[PDB]
Design a protein around this ligand. Structure first.
Ligand SMILES: *Cc1c(COP(=O)(O)O)cnc(C)c1O
Ligand SMILES: *Cc1c(COP(=O)(O)O)cnc(C)c1O
Ligand SMILES: [Cl-]
Ligand SMILES: [Cl-]
Lengths: 358, 360
């Protein structure tokens, strides 16, 4: 009777939460909660390391990348990245594919010279721009993309070959929804709360030799080098959030890893997109078909009265989270890894019944 | 199986009722059929928890209505830089009172951003005491005066606070916030990582006078402006929802036991058990702190030599004591006795200390 389509924080795998509940008072035979452990304890250090190792195995992260667990959300990364890499005489180059891309660019502008490599803003971010359109500069500090544009419902189907400067990706809303060639990136970051666990930890996967050096004048907490050198234990980490991340990663592994999860995600997205496409225009997706997200499906009915009726009916029927962001309007169905296919089927059935009764 | 005596210095022991409450409803919070961890931060169910945590803090510490309460990420360590970024301006001075390692860390971050000054320091005395307030060297263009209420590593604590009216008084209260009543109106801003006395790690509480920290900050990154978080009620970006939920649960527990005065009475009793054991030990245990600056939250002490220190800590670990190893700067032992550390663990520590001395 409850279908959780929340856009972040979001649904977690039942086994990960059940495991957490079962041992909440007695973690790993210590007779205390994981939340009561010192981050300097062997018990916690084992979890911290396992979470890293699971990420490394599941995404096939090369040995010369470091995995960091940071606080502050993806939003703090919007500023921390340019603080570390946008040096005088270089350019923070951005590909704009939605609202989250804009937020990232805005923070770089406060700190240095920026540039727009490509943008689909003028077309309401309905698509990912062709890579052949990208305007690249010899003095780029990096090229920043947003892999999944959570608000607009578009997603990179693949990633550009970028080697004049590091490619940086905000993968908050699609990290570990599919396999990745990590070597294509200088850095990947993601708040955990969309696809990896609860909120309060941000995963940063970074090429060590890019960022393992002290940057002059940058506050200690805001240097990647601080966290690299200290293995994300410079100050007190968000221990429960990291524990929950570990639990989620174990679930992904148990189901067969990134390939298996990608297959599930493709199947459940098809359920919703086919419903849109067969609706004779009653439901219209915001994204161009070739840029459709497998993680956030955005669509509208023919006018706002119909949008309101639909969302009111959905709320009455137990659906949570379906209201679209204002820039897109309509409905957003967030279908991250842990959202079950039966919830997607229920959404289809709701959509079909609503059209029939309109 | 070993008994548990949790003297961890941060993260730390939690109240059992708060954990039990969390466990019971972990899969279905407030009849939503979702964990609190699975809710939108813009849902009514989560907003109620967020607001309740603020209201409990406000009631328990008697925070005046013209103060705002923020829930931020990054730890107290991020506050070390965020504070001077927002208040340390050209032509002003970040003035610090140094009473331990945490004071030094705060000063260090301000130095990167502007002019700083040391109002007073007990560094030369190995941080064994809180300086006399008469020693404070103050400047007309201080942007603020910063203190560390409880010096977690050294085991000293402000017994009362200075009357400062020339500039804002700012305090890192990470390791003693809500261990006792507090006159909040004496401060412009108070911050604390939650993980010593308020909850689990992952959230930092900032109590700030509304009129104070959100001006002349155009050059400061969005996330690092207090103004951003003030305006959005700590929902600008996604908050650490489960940490704030757990904080709410801990605060309810404090309220249920009688509030700040009741917890201060418990804490004074706990500390007395340990300090009396040290003082009665004919030098077998020696406290780091001068008696008049002793912390009620972190009790620091050494045995006569490193071999005995090691043997004592090994015996402690065998008997189920967790977290007693001192920080390297004092060596020895540190018994952290935050709000939720039970008096019976202090009883157990005393018994261990008496037995170890008698068997040495
Ligand atoms: C939600 C989201 C963010 C912001 O994450 P916070 O952790 O709330 O700062 C950034 N980028 C994308 C793509 C998102 O979906
Ligand atoms: C632990 C502590 C800190 C550091 O807190 P983090 O949350 O680890 O950054 C700062 N000040 C005091 C007094 C502390 O005890
Ligand atoms: Cl977006
Ligand atoms: Cl200290």
């Amino acid at each position: 009777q409850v279908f959780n389509f929340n856009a972040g924080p979001s649904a977690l795998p039942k086994p990960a939460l059940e495991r957490a509940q079962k041992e909440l008072l007695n973690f790993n035979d210590t007779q205390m909660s994981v939340m009561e452990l010192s981050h300097r304890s062997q018990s916690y250090e084992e979890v911290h390391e396992q979470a890293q190792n699971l990420l490394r195995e599941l995404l096939q992260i090369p040995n010369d990348y470091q995995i960091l667990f940071l606080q502050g959300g993806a939003s703090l990364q919007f500023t921390m990245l340019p603080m570390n890499l946008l040096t005088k005489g270089t350019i923070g180059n951005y590909v704009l594919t939605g609202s989250w891309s804009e937020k990232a660019l805005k923070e770089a502008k406060l700190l240095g010279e920026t540039h727009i490599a490509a943008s689909t803003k003028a077309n309401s971010y309905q698509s990912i721009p062709d890579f052949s359109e990208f305007q690249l500069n010899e003095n780029d500090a990096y090229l920043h993309i947003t892999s999944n544009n959570t608000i607009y419902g578009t997603q990179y189907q693949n990633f550009p070959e970028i080697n004049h400067a590091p490619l940086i990706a905000d993968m908050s809303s699609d990290i570990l929804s599919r396999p990745l060639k990590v070597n294509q990136f200088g850095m990947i970051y993601a708040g955990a709360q969309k696809n990896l666990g609860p909120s309060g930890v941000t995963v940063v996967i970074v090429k060590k030799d890019l960022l393992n050096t002290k940057v002059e004048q940058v506050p200690t907490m805001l240097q990647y080098a601080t966290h690299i050198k200290s293995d994300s234990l410079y100050n007190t980490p968000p221990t429960f959030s990291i524990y929950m991340l570990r639990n989620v990663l174990d679930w992904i592994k148990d189901l067969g890893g990134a390939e298996a999860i990608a297959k599930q995600n493709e199947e459940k997205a098809k359920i919703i997109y086919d419903t849109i496409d067969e609706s004779n225009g009653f439901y219209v997706g915001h994204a161009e078909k070739g840029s459709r997200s497998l993680m956030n499906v955005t669509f509208n009915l023919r006018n706002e009265e119909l949008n309101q009726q639909f969302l009111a009916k959905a709320k009455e029927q137990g659906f949570v989270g379906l209201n679209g962001h204002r820039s897109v309007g309509g409905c957003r169905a967030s279908i991250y890894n842990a959202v079950p296919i039966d919830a997607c089927i229920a959404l289809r059935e709701l959509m079909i019944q609503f059209k029939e009764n309109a």
